Design an enzyme around this catalytic site. Sequence first.
Site, mmCIF file in Angstrom:
data_model
loop_
_atom_site.group_PDB
_atom_site.id
_atom_site.type_symbol
_atom_site.label_atom_id
_atom_site.label_comp_id
_atom_site.label_asym_id
_atom_site.label_seq_id
_atom_site.Cartn_x
_atom_site.Cartn_y
_atom_site.Cartn_z
ATOM 1 N N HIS A 41 37.647 44.520 37.868
ATOM 2 C CA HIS A 41 36.933 44.869 39.377
ATOM 3 C C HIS A 41 37.327 46.075 39.722
ATOM 4 O O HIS A 41 36.614 46.942 40.541
ATOM 5 C CB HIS A 41 36.983 43.747 40.106
ATOM 6 C CG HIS A 41 38.432 43.865 40.819
ATOM 7 N ND1 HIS A 41 39.336 42.753 40.370
ATOM 8 C CD2 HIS A 41 38.920 44.099 41.942
ATOM 9 C CE1 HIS A 41 40.384 42.939 41.126
ATOM 10 N NE2 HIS A 41 40.098 43.885 42.211
ATOM 11 N N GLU A 72 39.030 39.206 33.467
ATOM 12 C CA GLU A 72 39.242 40.218 34.348
ATOM 13 C C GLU A 72 40.383 41.267 33.893
ATOM 14 O O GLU A 72 40.939 41.869 34.922
ATOM 15 C CB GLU A 72 40.089 39.477 35.694
ATOM 16 C CG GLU A 72 40.130 39.866 37.127
ATOM 17 C CD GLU A 72 38.825 40.721 37.207
ATOM 18 O OE1 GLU A 72 37.759 40.353 36.658
ATOM 19 O OE2 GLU A 72 38.807 41.445 38.027
ATOM 20 N N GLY A 146 44.927 45.798 47.770
ATOM 21 C CA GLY A 146 45.597 46.986 47.305
ATOM 22 C C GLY A 146 46.887 46.713 46.300
ATOM 23 O O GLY A 146 47.544 47.438 46.090
ATOM 24 N N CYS A 148 46.250 44.609 43.809
ATOM 25 C CA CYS A 148 45.278 44.426 42.414
ATOM 26 C C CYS A 148 46.190 45.402 41.364
ATOM 27 O O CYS A 148 46.215 46.331 41.783
ATOM 28 C CB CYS A 148 43.979 44.326 42.397
ATOM 29 S SG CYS A 148 43.486 42.603 43.262
HETATM 30 C C1 LIG Z 1 42.178 43.166 44.436
HETATM 31 O O1 LIG Z 1 42.678 44.336 45.133
HETATM 32 C C2 LIG Z 1 42.221 42.105 45.372
HETATM 33 C C3 LIG Z 1 43.329 41.433 46.014
HETATM 34 C C4 LIG Z 1 43.257 40.165 46.931
HETATM 35 C C5 LIG Z 1 42.603 40.408 48.322
HETATM 36 C C6 LIG Z 1 43.724 39.811 49.276
HETATM 37 N N1 LIG Z 1 44.551 39.132 48.371
HETATM 38 C C7 LIG Z 1 44.355 39.472 47.120
HETATM 39 O O2 LIG Z 1 45.377 39.037 46.171
HETATM 40 N N2 LIG Z 1 41.373 41.016 44.795
HETATM 41 C C8 LIG Z 1 40.161 40.662 45.261
HETATM 42 O O3 LIG Z 1 39.430 41.119 46.105
HETATM 43 C C9 LIG Z 1 39.157 39.845 44.517
HETATM 44 C C10 LIG Z 1 38.155 40.477 43.917
HETATM 45 C C11 LIG Z 1 37.802 39.964 42.619
HETATM 46 C C12 LIG Z 1 38.472 39.226 41.813
HETATM 47 C C13 LIG Z 1 38.128 38.893 40.513
HETATM 48 C C14 LIG Z 1 36.614 39.268 39.916
HETATM 49 C C15 LIG Z 1 36.088 39.827 40.841
HETATM 50 C C16 LIG Z 1 36.475 40.487 42.130
HETATM 51 N N3 LIG Z 1 38.629 38.627 44.971
HETATM 52 C C17 LIG Z 1 39.122 37.646 46.156
HETATM 53 O O4 LIG Z 1 40.533 37.932 46.147
HETATM 54 O O5 LIG Z 1 38.590 36.677 46.698
HETATM 55 C C18 LIG Z 1 38.846 35.780 47.674
HETATM 56 C C19 LIG Z 1 38.685 34.471 46.876
HETATM 57 C C20 LIG Z 1 37.755 33.253 47.487
HETATM 58 C C21 LIG Z 1 40.298 33.869 46.746
#
Ligand SMILES: *[C@H](O)[C@H](C[C@@H]1CCNC1=O)NC(=O)[C@H](Cc1ccccc1)NC(=O)OCC(C)C
Length: 181
Positions: A41, A72, A146, A148
């Site tokens: 992503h 991913e 931030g 990820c």
């Molecule tokens: C990446 O920077 C971010 C980190 C998240 C946000 C708060 N804590 C974390 O560990 N990850 C995301 O935003 C992901 C986005 C994503 C992931 C996989 C495929 C596509 C997009 N999404 C996310 O955390 O969504 C919340 C869920 C309901 C658990």
Amino acid sequence: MGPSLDFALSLLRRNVRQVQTDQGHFTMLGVRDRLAVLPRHSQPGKTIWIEHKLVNILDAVELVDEQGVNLELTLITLDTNEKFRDITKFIPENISTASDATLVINTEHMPSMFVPVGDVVQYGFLNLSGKPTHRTMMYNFPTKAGQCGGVVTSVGKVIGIHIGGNGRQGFCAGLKRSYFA
Ligand SMILES: *[C@H](O)[C@H](C[C@@H]1CCNC1=O)NC(=O)[C@H](Cc1ccccc1)NC(=O)OCC(C)C
């Protein structure tokens, strides 16, 4: 200095990079040669900011499981002068769990950050922001945005790339050595 600090600091030194993309700041793991890996992503384009310079990306490969589903992870091949230190050996042949794991984050905003995520356990399936994703793993730590790209490590093993969190839990896309051959 002791074993695991030396290992985690050696990665910070040689393999873990601060990067930026249209999506924001991420942690990149340079695995060997000109091959790096990022969260999918993160959406890397034709170029990527790597710390002090914009680096050309030659090839970008988004990984899917046997059933054509999201892993991913993007394998990016870089137009860079020198080879990454080979850490493929540190990566398990099949996705492994760990105990007392450490999240290593390197970013402009959170540089050389060490986060004690704890035991890492099979989650199997996670859906984040609309995309269905396999081969994930879970740690019970409140992981912020931030973070990820952050590298899940235990005892000289490199086991996941951070991809997600729900505010009480973190999930990473587990690493398999076959990915990087
Ligand atoms: C990446 O920077 C971010 C980190 C998240 C946000 C708060 N804590 C974390 O560990 N990850 C995301 O935003 C992901 C986005 C994503 C992931 C996989 C495929 C596509 C997009 N999404 C996310 O955390 O969504 C919340 C869920 C309901 C658990």
